[PDB]
Amino acid sequence: MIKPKYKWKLTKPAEYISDELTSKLKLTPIVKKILESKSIIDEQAIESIISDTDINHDALQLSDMTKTIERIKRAIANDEKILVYGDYDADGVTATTILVITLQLLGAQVGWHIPNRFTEGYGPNELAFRNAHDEGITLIITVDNGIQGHNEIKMVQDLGVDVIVTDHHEIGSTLPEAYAIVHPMHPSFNYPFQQLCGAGVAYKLAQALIENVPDYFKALVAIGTIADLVSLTDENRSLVKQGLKVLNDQCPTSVKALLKEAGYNDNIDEETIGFIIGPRLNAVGRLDDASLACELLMTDVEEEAAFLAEQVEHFNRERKDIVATITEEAMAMAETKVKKGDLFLLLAKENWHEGVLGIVASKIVETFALPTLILNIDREQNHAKGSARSIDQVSMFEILSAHQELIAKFGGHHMAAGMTMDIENIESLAEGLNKWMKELSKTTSLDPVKQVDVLLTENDITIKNIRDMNRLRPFGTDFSRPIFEMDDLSVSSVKAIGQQKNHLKLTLGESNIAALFWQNGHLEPELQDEQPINILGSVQINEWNGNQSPQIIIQDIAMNEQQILDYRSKRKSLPFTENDENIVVLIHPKSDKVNANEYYYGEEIKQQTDKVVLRDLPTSMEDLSNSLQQLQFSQLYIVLQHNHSIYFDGIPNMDIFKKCYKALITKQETNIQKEGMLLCQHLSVKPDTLKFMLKVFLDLKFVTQEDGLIRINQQPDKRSIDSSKVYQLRQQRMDVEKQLLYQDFSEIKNWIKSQL
């Protein structure tokens, strides 16, 4: 049986869209299912998402905005020399182009410099700032950098060179000493949308310096806003619909040349900006510097754009190869560590190119679902510089700050970070992170999760229904791309495609829906036999010879078969060791939790629960329901260890309880050792059941006891009619014995198939 890699959380929309609006707004079932799983139901929201009125807030409401506008205007008037300081991100290259063109249109002596990731690193560098002063630069406008360059800015500011900081990266407790700081998230000011990218901040500064901005600027903001992965809500959303509009209607010279090098000519949307255009502009600044990418974006002559688009695409080539090699070596090292049981993948080797290390780390976290540090051992500089990527259950900042004594310089956040340390401290640091992770392994679950937006049926996979979903685009952060679940799907056709037969081609269901699972062509032999499979994935339209067809890109795959096995008398024959980790053991309080697998009923196990063993008899059917209603398994093992039974002993009727109280009221104080047998006689009950009755009377505090001597509390609180917690426990215990221990497995299966 194929095992799911993730653990699937399907959103069950509590609210649904009116069947009137569904019709008033021509909402096909797929767009309707997506909207509802984002809970966007009211007419405003739906219109907001489908509408195109642009989102535009006075850029004058930005931090130090007017203060800045005039500082730039004056420099152009006094023939001052300008320098735009930028970054090698696609946001920084797109932001530089916008500002340089804006200043060129204002007739300014503008020049630009992008720091080298290796020779200079990110942000202001003393040498460059001094060099600019030496070149007569009087004003430096930074883009996607500066908010954390206090020292460098002050030095040059004291040299007489004003610095205007424009950034969107998290601000610190201290703001650098500079003429002006334009930041959407600045303490002293409040701007409607605070999730703008560097290009977005530049667009607003431009819209303020020049009233009407060239349309190229909108496309450039779109490229950077989708690459910096900023929130795709409010403003960012409109600029992308506009910038995606521009790239199709009036495609720029610079960008055209690029996609001609990739060989891409189909309609352009956010994924093109994500997977195709974005990653090419970064390649240059990850191997060589990105001035080329800026020069490509700045050029509108087909001849040079084409010559320059060649030099970029060459770098995209090499990044694929350099990443491919580093990963081959690192995937080999990671397999050993995880096989030895590491929980933090700290991989450190030599000749590892640093410009691609963050990339290599993302492939490692996706393949292993573990937080990873990827380091290059530079023995020519006795430093280990590298990158880190995280999982949600772990903050990369915290765990490094707790181990910061072994680290020389480390900066980043919860999901990612950059570090420089000593080659001799790596082996010491790995154990520390592993210790921190193996302690969190208790308080926290580390198994990968996937959020499922919609449960789609074969009757929704229509070309019309799938393109109408191209109406909710653009998709991205804060408006994530939908993930669909499809169950009870037959594996009609199965094939292994690719030179190395690594991709899997499949036909699904009775309607034979084409599906592809990349890098999983090794599962063909298992899916050859006709078998029903549940699937998670995205829906798109593949077009061949003018014929459009629905296609599903699978992300995860599970076998629909749910197996329930009777070991109700074969406990010692379980096919696994109690300490197997992959197996979850559902137990009840009477036993002490010895292993982490042992989780009590009702308690929320969050470890992947593909193989679940019901070791102890549930205290209640609903407690099992709770511990079952959270179950995603392929094989359930029902052992149900119990030491005694109550099925035949029975619960005394309520007429007998009063006939016990009768004896108690007659003497007030009684000793059960001498009076119990006579007591049990007139009650026509047994010794064990008398304890139960006295134990409910003591629970209801109707009586008190001391060394066998039972005493009456006279008038007690009228808590209930013998409806005590102890009385209830018995009711539930007899309930579980009748349905689970002393019933037929067939009907037990027909109940476990009722819950889940």
**Residues in touch with Mg ion (CB under 5 A):** 91, 144, 198, 228
> How far is residue 325 CA from its own chain's centroid?
27
Q: Which two tokens stand for residue 70?
A: 């005039």
**Closest Cα to residue 683, out of 707, 715, 659, 647?**
659
**CB closer to Mg ion out of 91 and 295:** 91
Min dist. Cβ of residue 223 to Mg ion (A):
11
Min dist. Cβ of residue 219 to Mg ion (A):
17
Min dist. Cβ of residue 247 to Mg ion (A):
20
Min dist. Cβ of residue 286 to Mg ion (A):
15
Q: Hey, CA dihedral for 50, 276, 286, 405, is it positive or negative?
A: positive
Measured from each CB, the residue nearest to Mg ion is 91
Min dist. Cβ of residue 87 to Mg ion (A):
7
- The answer to whether residues 542 and 514 touch, using CB atoms and an 8 Å cutoff, is yes
Backbone phi and psi for residue 305, each to the nearest 5 degrees, phi listed first: -55, -40
Side chain identity, residue 417: A
**CB closer to Mg ion out of 163 and 656:** 163
- The answer to whether residues 165 and 146 touch, using CB atoms and an 8 Å cutoff, is yes
**CB closer to Mg ion out of 91 and 598:** 91
**CB closer to Mg ion out of 201 and 584:** 201
What single DSSP character describes residue 26? Answer: T
Q: Hey, CA dihedral for 592, 593, 598, 604, is it positive or negative?
A: positive
First CA to last CA distance, the chain: 19
Side chain identity, residue 115: P
Q: Which two tokens stand for residue 3?
A: 């095992």
The dihedral region occupied by 417, where left means phi > 0, alpha psi between -120 and 50, and beta the remainder, is: beta
- Using omega within 30 degrees of 0 as the cis cutoff, is the peptide bond preceding 474 cis? yes
Min dist. Cβ of residue 197 to Mg ion (A):
5
**CB closer to Mg ion out of 93 and 255:** 93
Min dist. Cβ of residue 230 to Mg ion (A):
8
**CB closer to Mg ion out of 228 and 610:** 228
**CB closer to Mg ion out of 89 and 460:** 89
* CB neighbour list of residue 476: distance below 8 Å, 6 or more residues apart: 226, 229, 232, 240, 270, 274
Side chain identity, residue 544: W
Question: Measured between alpha carbons, how far is 630 from 611 in angstroms, rounded to an integer?
Answer: 13
Q: What is the dihedral of CA 11, 16, 21, 23, to 10 degrees?
A: 80
**CB closer to Mg ion out of 166 and 272:** 166
Min dist. Cβ of residue 450 to Mg ion (A):
28
Min dist. Cβ of residue 66 to Mg ion (A):
24
User: In 118-273, where does DSSP find H-type helix?
Assistant: 126-134, 150-158, 198-209, 215-227, 234-249, 253-262, 270-271
**CB closer to Mg ion out of 87 and 623:** 87
Min dist. Cβ of residue 89 to Mg ion (A):
5
Min dist. Cβ of residue 227 to Mg ion (A):
8
Question: Measured between alpha carbons, how far is 82 from 103 in angstroms, rounded to an integer?
Answer: 9
Q: Which two tokens stand for residue 428?
A: 């010491």
Min dist. Cβ of residue 477 to Mg ion (A):
13
Min dist. Cβ of residue 529 to Mg ion (A):
51
Side chain identity, residue 161: V
**CB closer to Mg ion out of 202 and 209:** 202
What single DSSP character describes residue 70? Answer: H
**CB closer to Mg ion out of 167 and 342:** 167
Min dist. Cβ of residue 149 to Mg ion (A):
15
Question: Measured between alpha carbons, how far is 536 from 556 in angstroms, rounded to an integer?
Answer: 5
**CB closer to Mg ion out of 144 and 616:** 144
The CA-atom distances, in angstroms, between 590 and each of 142, 628, 642 are: 66, 20, 10
Long-range contacts of 749-753 (CB under 8 A, 24+ apart): 749/564, 752/564, 752/628, 752/636, 753/562
**CB closer to Mg ion out of 237 and 615:** 237
**CB closer to Mg ion out of 197 and 679:** 197
Q: Which two tokens stand for residue 633?
A: 């398994």
**CB closer to Mg ion out of 167 and 623:** 167
Min dist. Cβ of residue 545 to Mg ion (A):
42
* CB neighbour list of residue 286: distance below 8 Å, 6 or more residues apart: 88, 117, 319, 355, 356, 359
Question: Measured between alpha carbons, how far is 625 from 621 in angstroms, rounded to an integer?
Answer: 6
**CB closer to Mg ion out of 195 and 620:** 195
Q: Which residue bears the tokens 């499979």? A: 533
- The answer to whether residues 379 and 426 touch, using CB atoms and an 8 Å cutoff, is no
Question: Measured between alpha carbons, how far is 606 from 100 in angstroms, rounded to an integer?
Answer: 52
Min dist. Cβ of residue 352 to Mg ion (A):
25
Q: What is the dihedral of CA 22, 24, 25, 29, to 10 degrees?
A: 20
Question: Measured between alpha carbons, how far is 194 from 251 in angstroms, rounded to an integer?
Answer: 29
Pairing status of strand 513-517 against strand 547-559:
parallel
